[PDB]
Ligand binder design. Structure first.
Ligand SMILES: [Mg+2]
Ligand SMILES: [Mg+2]
Ligand SMILES: [Mg+2]
Ligand SMILES: [Mg+2]
Ligand SMILES: [Mg+2]
Ligand SMILES: [Mg+2]
Ligand SMILES: [Mg+2]
Ligand SMILES: [Mg+2]
Ligand SMILES: [Mg+2]
Ligand SMILES: [Mg+2]
Ligand SMILES: [Mg+2]
Ligand SMILES: [Mg+2]
Ligand SMILES: [Mg+2]
Ligand SMILES: [Mg+2]
Ligand SMILES: [Mg+2]
Ligand SMILES: [Mg+2]
Ligand SMILES: [Mg+2]
Ligand SMILES: [Mg+2]
Ligand SMILES: [Mg+2]
Ligand SMILES: [Mg+2]
Ligand SMILES: [Mg+2]
Ligand SMILES: [Mg+2]
Ligand SMILES: [Mg+2]
Ligand SMILES: [Mg+2]
Ligand SMILES: [Mg+2]
Ligand SMILES: [Mg+2]
Ligand SMILES: [Mg+2]
Ligand SMILES: [Mg+2]
Ligand SMILES: [Mg+2]
Ligand SMILES: [Mg+2]
Ligand SMILES: [Mg+2]
Ligand SMILES: [Mg+2]
Ligand SMILES: [Mg+2]
Ligand SMILES: [Mg+2]
Ligand SMILES: [Mg+2]
Ligand SMILES: [Mg+2]
Ligand SMILES: [Mg+2]
Ligand SMILES: [Mg+2]
Ligand SMILES: [Mg+2]
Ligand SMILES: [Mg+2]
Ligand SMILES: [Mg+2]
Ligand SMILES: [Mg+2]
Ligand SMILES: [Mg+2]
Ligand SMILES: [Mg+2]
Ligand SMILES: [Mg+2]
Ligand SMILES: [Mg+2]
Ligand SMILES: [Mg+2]
Ligand SMILES: [Mg+2]
Ligand SMILES: [Mg+2]
Ligand SMILES: [Mg+2]
Ligand SMILES: [Mg+2]
Ligand SMILES: [Mg+2]
Ligand SMILES: [Mg+2]
Ligand SMILES: [Mg+2]
Ligand SMILES: [Mg+2]
Ligand SMILES: [Mg+2]
Ligand SMILES: [Mg+2]
Ligand SMILES: [Mg+2]
Ligand SMILES: [Mg+2]
Ligand SMILES: [Mg+2]
Ligand SMILES: [Mg+2]
Ligand SMILES: [Mg+2]
Ligand SMILES: [Mg+2]
Ligand SMILES: [Mg+2]
Ligand SMILES: [Mg+2]
Ligand SMILES: [Mg+2]
Ligand SMILES: [Mg+2]
Ligand SMILES: [Mg+2]
Ligand SMILES: [Mg+2]
Ligand SMILES: [Mg+2]
Ligand SMILES: [Mg+2]
Ligand SMILES: [Mg+2]
Ligand SMILES: [Mg+2]
Ligand SMILES: [Mg+2]
Ligand SMILES: [Mg+2]
Ligand SMILES: [Mg+2]
Ligand SMILES: [Mg+2]
Ligand SMILES: [Mg+2]
Ligand SMILES: [Mg+2]
Ligand SMILES: [Mg+2]
Ligand SMILES: [Mg+2]
Ligand SMILES: [Mg+2]
Ligand SMILES: [Mg+2]
Ligand SMILES: [Mg+2]
Ligand SMILES: [Mg+2]
Ligand SMILES: [Mg+2]
Ligand SMILES: [Mg+2]
Ligand SMILES: [Mg+2]
Ligand SMILES: [Mg+2]
Ligand SMILES: [Mg+2]
Ligand SMILES: [Mg+2]
Ligand SMILES: [Mg+2]
Ligand SMILES: [Mg+2]
Ligand SMILES: [Mg+2]
Ligand SMILES: [Mg+2]
Ligand SMILES: [Mg+2]
Ligand SMILES: [Mg+2]
Ligand SMILES: [Mg+2]
Ligand SMILES: [Mg+2]
Ligand SMILES: [Mg+2]
Ligand SMILES: [Mg+2]
Ligand SMILES: [Mg+2]
Ligand SMILES: [Mg+2]
Ligand SMILES: [Mg+2]
Ligand SMILES: [Mg+2]
Ligand SMILES: [Mg+2]
Ligand SMILES: [Mg+2]
Ligand SMILES: [Mg+2]
Ligand SMILES: [Mg+2]
Ligand SMILES: [Mg+2]
Ligand SMILES: [Mg+2]
Ligand SMILES: [Mg+2]
Ligand SMILES: [Mg+2]
Ligand SMILES: [Mg+2]
Ligand SMILES: [Mg+2]
Ligand SMILES: [Mg+2]
Ligand SMILES: [Mg+2]
Ligand SMILES: [Mg+2]
Ligand SMILES: [Mg+2]
Ligand SMILES: [Mg+2]
Ligand SMILES: [Mg+2]
Ligand SMILES: [Mg+2]
Ligand SMILES: [Mg+2]
Ligand SMILES: [Mg+2]
Ligand SMILES: [Mg+2]
Ligand SMILES: [Mg+2]
Lengths: 72, 119, 185, 212
RNA sequence: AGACAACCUGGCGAACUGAAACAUCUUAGUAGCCAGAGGAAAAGAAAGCAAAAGCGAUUCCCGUAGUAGCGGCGAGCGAAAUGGGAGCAGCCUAAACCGUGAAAACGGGGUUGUGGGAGAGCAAUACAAGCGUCGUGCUGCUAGGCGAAUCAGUGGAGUGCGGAACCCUAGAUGGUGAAAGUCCAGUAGCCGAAAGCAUCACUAGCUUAUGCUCUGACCCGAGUAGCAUGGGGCACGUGGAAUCCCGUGUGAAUCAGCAAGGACCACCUUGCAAGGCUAAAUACUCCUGGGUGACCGAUAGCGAAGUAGUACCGUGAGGGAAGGGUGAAAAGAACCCCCAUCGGGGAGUGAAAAGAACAUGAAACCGUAAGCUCUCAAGCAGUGGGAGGGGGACCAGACCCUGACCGCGUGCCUGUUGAAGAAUGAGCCGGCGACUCAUAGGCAGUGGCUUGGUUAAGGGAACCCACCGGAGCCGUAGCGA
RNA sequence: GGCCAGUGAGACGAUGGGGGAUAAGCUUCAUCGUCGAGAGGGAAACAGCCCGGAUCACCAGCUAAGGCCCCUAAAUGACC
RNA sequence: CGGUAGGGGAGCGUUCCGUGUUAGGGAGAAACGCGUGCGUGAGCCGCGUUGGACGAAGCGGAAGCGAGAAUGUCGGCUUG
């Protein structure tokens, strides 16, 4: 009984991984106030986007058991 | 495994102290001061090994100017040197200074060659 | 060229000597140690949380939770051990041989762990099998059993464990079958 | 095999020849594999017994300036600390375990490479076990000197059996190690000047570690 | 009855802290305090898990797993079943009924769950198994004993050195004027207990015991379960909130029952609450006996190698130091001289005076002697040039010490847009004094296998370690809530 | 792309401007240089101006910016 | 081939362990003091009209492993 790293749970309900090993997320803002957002915008906010390279650190740091390829 | 520092320090200190022998006052005594004083010494040394190369050319030139000025009324260092070059002689300033002191007659001759040829 | 305790030594590069910070400048990271000047990151003690940016609403908090997870809809889980035909080709199977589950542990092309142990087997078509094999599994993909019955292999489909049903629902589901049967006949 | 082995009877004449053929580490990494194996061995042997007291173990704190001077431990107005004499020890040793791991196959490889380096020394023997009945040290040493072992240089007897008479008869020489396969270490092989096997032993070793 | 280090059980039960504030949450049911018992305690013999296939009291380790989940869905918290091991053990009682009484009690009977027992009849009987005064037994512990093998030379001393020998079931260890298998005490090996203790066997004795058939009417742990409310605890924060345990109030059913299977109802499966008791595997060190130490060596190691919980300080709770190493042996210096003692100088002891404030004895700091040199001088004290003077040389043209006079030269650190700063810090010297360890994640470098790789706990001639131990784990399929 | 840092108080100078009084060694931006983190020379001394970017030795030589009465290196040079 | 924050490479030393009950050592070890010795440096190698019993090199391993700053800290000793 040592200590093993804990997965940061609030980060894992947000991000996940695709089979080839890139991280993805939802897009923000499709929840309420949709009437005044045009359909085109709503479609754009419906899809799954690969997380910006920049944040990869923070994310990766808080989800140590996520299997991830950064493509090396 | 506990390790006392032992002599590793005192040797270093001692080998510094050897350096600082014959410094007046507490520069030859206390370790902490001695350190600094070592560094400064080493530093001046380095500096003045460069100054040295400047200062002897200072000197040499001065002595040469003195040595020549005796002959002509109108003769200089500047004139001299310019004349040494347009006559194609290689002698540098150390040699002309040491020959100015230690073999004066020689310099008189040299001057007589430069004069004869500029004539 | 004989080994003794004294001629031994490591491989170049193997054990690289570690930075000891805080010793000397000329060495390495002396004084500050490579923490630069001051403020939080140079201070001793636990840092700030990994996912946290300055008090701006952190990235993970400003993004909405993933689809099913978000409410407590159970996560999707593998229910079979998928095998292609590739693997069964590469393996040493001579004709007539039974494949099943067990004989795939035998040759090792599947190493099951706990969750996987408790599972059944399913076959996925990929690659083109040349042999006649006797295959046993709880399930097949369409392309699978198509390619299999095309190559002349016998496909034994194993029964799954009966779902217990109370009698009333048997009466309903049977009443159905009686309807179909009286209608076609 | 690229080299024979002498098989000697109890009197020291050469009866026969054998071959001991094993998995060797490929010639470049040999040294390092053995090395590693060794390091591992010694390092697991170690018992970290070194213990200190941290700043919180040390007897007799109270949190205050000291009221009066304890000669050598403090002065009148000072704060309690690690920086006194008789203060806690910052980053001292605590009892450890030093135990590291290594692959089984790697281990075995070190063993083989060592024993296969030892083929420039080693003899074989005709299994003397019976000739000793009452434990006799003097006798064992006699036998050694007939085989050409100086009871100086540290030699290793690897055999299958411990026959009590043999075992006790060798118990008191500091340079001998009588090994069963039960106890066989990389350490002792590396250490030993002369290697000595029985026939049954060669049959064992050449099987366990045999190259295919 | 009191005492008792840690461990343990029960009762009360915080706060700083984390959440970059804080209030739910965290810290943590931790510390502390009270009470209690043991060498372990507690838990424990399914009103249990599970899922349509099965298990078979409790505890502990590995793993599942940082998975399912919980959460101002924030900080964080965090299971279980399957699977592998360690270790194994199951028993007493209430009620129906039959005896004795007016009772309340006592004696027999009776204890189980894919139901048992009471009731009513007919068969079997001898072995088996469990407990245990008394006692020579076995072993061990608490005193012990026997125990192999060497000499001379070498400058205080020989165990060292050179040179000869020998023992070894003994070459562990400590001592000895100096390092020893062979000098001493010992070690291997082998013998030994009147008395007490302990584990084991046996030990009269004490215990128990089967088998079938009929009978739903008799029993199967009541102010209980449940229900309504108020909480607590379960990984699970009231949530759809099961299971578990408590305040207030109501309040069942007996096997044709009752409970559990994560609201609830049906169906099936599993189990039998409201009475008890029980060994081992596990935790710990005020200690006892052995062992080892990439542990300390007098500022270290325990606070304590000497009066150490002392001196001293505090009304009191409490705080809490320092002082080790003459020599092998005191052989601790007779006698004379200075002489009131101390102290000294000879002599004598000693390998050495090492001379008692005595072993190596650095620096600061205090001096003494010899070489050069300063009293018209301005300077972070040096440095490049070197007048004059002095010293030990062998490459005598060199080295070393001094320093007439010229030039150059704004202490160190920290920290700053920037410092000689009149910015901080250091009296000086010597010691002590800081990126450490454990466990995981990622990356790199090296190896090992790639007939994919690897074992965890666990076992090991004590450790290490051969050889096991495939449970797990990583890689072989993705997409999708 | 990977691994893994500091930095996130700047100063003046040239130039374009705003605020201010076309005040400030003021303040705030824009395009540059030096200092920061740069020693050497010129500037009496003199972070930010000019020259130039210091691997090291030499009792060698040529120059830049700048200078040639004496302190103090070089012309008490020439001609208007 | 200037260099602060800072990153990377190559090394030296200290105590201990392996080799090792090692080589060497009352024909004087550690240490202490010295050098016209060798290193880019940390340092090494040599020497002792000190000292009185231990202990290298090589090839490896481990850390209570290098001090001038902490109004650090304990002793010693100054200044006034
Ligand atoms: Mg995948
Ligand atoms: Mg919606
Ligand atoms: Mg980063
Ligand atoms: Mg030590
Ligand atoms: Mg230290
Ligand atoms: Mg001088
Ligand atoms: Mg490290
Ligand atoms: Mg480095
Ligand atoms: Mg510093
Ligand atoms: Mg850093
Ligand atoms: Mg700082
Ligand atoms: Mg910073
Ligand atoms: Mg902090
Ligand atoms: Mg945290
Ligand atoms: Mg939502
Ligand atoms: Mg999925
Ligand atoms: Mg797998
Ligand atoms: Mg304390
Ligand atoms: Mg201490
Ligand atoms: Mg009591
Ligand atoms: Mg009491
Ligand atoms: Mg007790
Ligand atoms: Mg709070
Ligand atoms: Mg608070
Ligand atoms: Mg903390
Ligand atoms: Mg807080
Ligand atoms: Mg805070
Ligand atoms: Mg026990
Ligand atoms: Mg109990
Ligand atoms: Mg049972
Ligand atoms: Mg029961
Ligand atoms: Mg289990
Ligand atoms: Mg078992
Ligand atoms: Mg059982
Ligand atoms: Mg009974
Ligand atoms: Mg049933
Ligand atoms: Mg029934
Ligand atoms: Mg009956
Ligand atoms: Mg005896
Ligand atoms: Mg004897
Ligand atoms: Mg002798
Ligand atoms: Mg001898
Ligand atoms: Mg003696
Ligand atoms: Mg001895
Ligand atoms: Mg004995
Ligand atoms: Mg019944
Ligand atoms: Mg109730
Ligand atoms: Mg309700
Ligand atoms: Mg209720
Ligand atoms: Mg609750
Ligand atoms: Mg609840
Ligand atoms: Mg229950
Ligand atoms: Mg359950
Ligand atoms: Mg219930
Ligand atoms: Mg309760
Ligand atoms: Mg009832
Ligand atoms: Mg049940
Ligand atoms: Mg019951
Ligand atoms: Mg209950
Ligand atoms: Mg019960
Ligand atoms: Mg109990
Ligand atoms: Mg002392
Ligand atoms: Mg002490
Ligand atoms: Mg001492
Ligand atoms: Mg006297
Ligand atoms: Mg008197
Ligand atoms: Mg006297
Ligand atoms: Mg005398
Ligand atoms: Mg004498
Ligand atoms: Mg002394
Ligand atoms: Mg005057
Ligand atoms: Mg004068
Ligand atoms: Mg003066
Ligand atoms: Mg001067
Ligand atoms: Mg000046
Ligand atoms: Mg000046
Ligand atoms: Mg300021
Ligand atoms: Mg100052
Ligand atoms: Mg400042
Ligand atoms: Mg300031
Ligand atoms: Mg200080
Ligand atoms: Mg001050
Ligand atoms: Mg340190
Ligand atoms: Mg850190
Ligand atoms: Mg670590
Ligand atoms: Mg790691
Ligand atoms: Mg590899
Ligand atoms: Mg193991
Ligand atoms: Mg064990
Ligand atoms: Mg073990
Ligand atoms: Mg900002
Ligand atoms: Mg700012
Ligand atoms: Mg700052
Ligand atoms: Mg400006
Ligand atoms: Mg401007
Ligand atoms: Mg304009
Ligand atoms: Mg104007
Ligand atoms: Mg303006
Ligand atoms: Mg300004
Ligand atoms: Mg310009
Ligand atoms: Mg700066
Ligand atoms: Mg620059
Ligand atoms: Mg400049
Ligand atoms: Mg200047
Ligand atoms: Mg420039
Ligand atoms: Mg250049
Ligand atoms: Mg010129
Ligand atoms: Mg001039
Ligand atoms: Mg003029
Ligand atoms: Mg350059
Ligand atoms: Mg550089
Ligand atoms: Mg740097
Ligand atoms: Mg060394
Ligand atoms: Mg050493
Ligand atoms: Mg020796
Ligand atoms: Mg010596
Ligand atoms: Mg030593
Ligand atoms: Mg040396
Ligand atoms: Mg060396
Ligand atoms: Mg001695
Ligand atoms: Mg060595
Ligand atoms: Mg040394
Ligand atoms: Mg330390
Ligand atoms: Mg100091
Ligand atoms: Mg002060
Ligand atoms: Mg002091």
């Amino acid at each position: 009984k040592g200590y093993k790293m804990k997965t940061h749970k609030a980060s894992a309900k947000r991000f996940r991984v695709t089979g080839k090993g890139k991280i993805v997320r939802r897009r923000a803002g499709k929840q309420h106030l949709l009437a005044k957002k045009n359909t085109k915008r709503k479609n754009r906010l419906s899809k799954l986007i690969q997380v910006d390279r920049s944040d990869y650190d923070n994310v990766i740091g808080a989800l140590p058991y996520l299997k991830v390829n950064r493509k090396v | 495994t506990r390790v006392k520092r032992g002599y590793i320090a005192r040797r270093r200190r001692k080998k510094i102290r050897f350096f600082a022998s014959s410094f007046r006052g507490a520069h030859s005594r206390l370790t902490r001061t001695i350190a600094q004083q070592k560094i400064r010494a080493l530093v001046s040394a380095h500096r003045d090994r460069d100054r040295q190369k400047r200062d002897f050319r200072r000197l040499w030139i001065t002595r040469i100017n003195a040595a020549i000025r005796e002959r002509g009324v109108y003769y200089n260092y500047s004139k001299f040197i310019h004349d040494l070059y347009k006559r194609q002689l290689l002698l540098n300033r150390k040699i002309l200074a040491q020959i100015a002191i230690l073999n004066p007659n020689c310099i008189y001759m040299i001057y007589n060659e430069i004069i004869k040829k500029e004539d | 060229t004989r080994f003794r305790l004294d001629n031994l030594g490591p491989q170049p590069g193997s054990r690289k000597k570690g930075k000891r910070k805080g010793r000397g400048h000329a060495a390495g990271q002396g004084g500050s140690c490579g923490f630069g000047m001051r403020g939080q990151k140079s201070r001793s003690g636990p840092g700030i949380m990994r996912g946290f940016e300055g008090g701006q609403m952190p990235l993970y908090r400003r993004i909405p939770k993933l689809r099913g997870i978000a409410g407590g809809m159970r996560a999707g889980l593998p229910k079979y051990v998928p095998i292609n035909l590739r693997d069964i080709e590469v393996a040493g199977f001579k004709e007539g041989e039974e494949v099943s589950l067990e004989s795939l542990k035998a040759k090792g092309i599947i190493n099951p762990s706990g969750r996987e142990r408790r599972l059944p087997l399913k076959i996925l078509g990929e690659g083109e099998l040349s042999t006649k094999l006797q295959i046993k599994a709880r399930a097949f993909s369409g392309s699978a059993k198509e390619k299999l019955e095309a190559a002349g292999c016998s496909v034994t489909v194993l029964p799954g464990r009966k779902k217990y049903i109370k009698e009333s629902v048997r009466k309903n589901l049977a009443r159905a079958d009686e309807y179909f049967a009286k209608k076609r006949a | 095999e690229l080299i024979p082995l002498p098989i000697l009877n109890f009197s020291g004449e050469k009866v026969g020849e054998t071959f001991l053929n094993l998995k060797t580490a490929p010639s470049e990494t040999a040294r390092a594999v053995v090395h590693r194996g060794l390091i591992t061995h010694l390092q697991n042997k170690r018992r970290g017994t070194a213990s200190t007291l941290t700043r919180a173990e040390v007897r007799g704190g109270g949190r205050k300036p000291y009221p009066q001077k304890k000669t050598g431990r403090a002065r009148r107005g000072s704060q309690r600390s690690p920086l006194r004499p008789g203060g806690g020890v910052i980053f001292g040793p605590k009892p450890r375990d030093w135990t590291i791991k290594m692959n089984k196959k790697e281990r075995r490889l070190a063993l083989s490479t060592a024993i296969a380096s030892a083929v420039g020394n080693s003899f074989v023997v005709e299994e003397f076990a019976e000739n000793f009945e009452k434990p006799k040290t003097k006798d064992f040493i006699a036998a050694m000197q007939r085989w050409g072992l100086d009871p100086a240089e540290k030699s290793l007897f690897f055999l299958m059996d411990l026959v009590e008479n043999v075992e006790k008869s060798g118990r008191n020489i500091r340079t001998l190690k009588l090994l069963t396969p039960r106890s066989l270490n990389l350490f002792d092989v590396l250490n030993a000047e002369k290697l000595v096997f029985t026939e049954g032993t060669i049959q064992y070793l050449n099987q366990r570690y045999g190259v295919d």
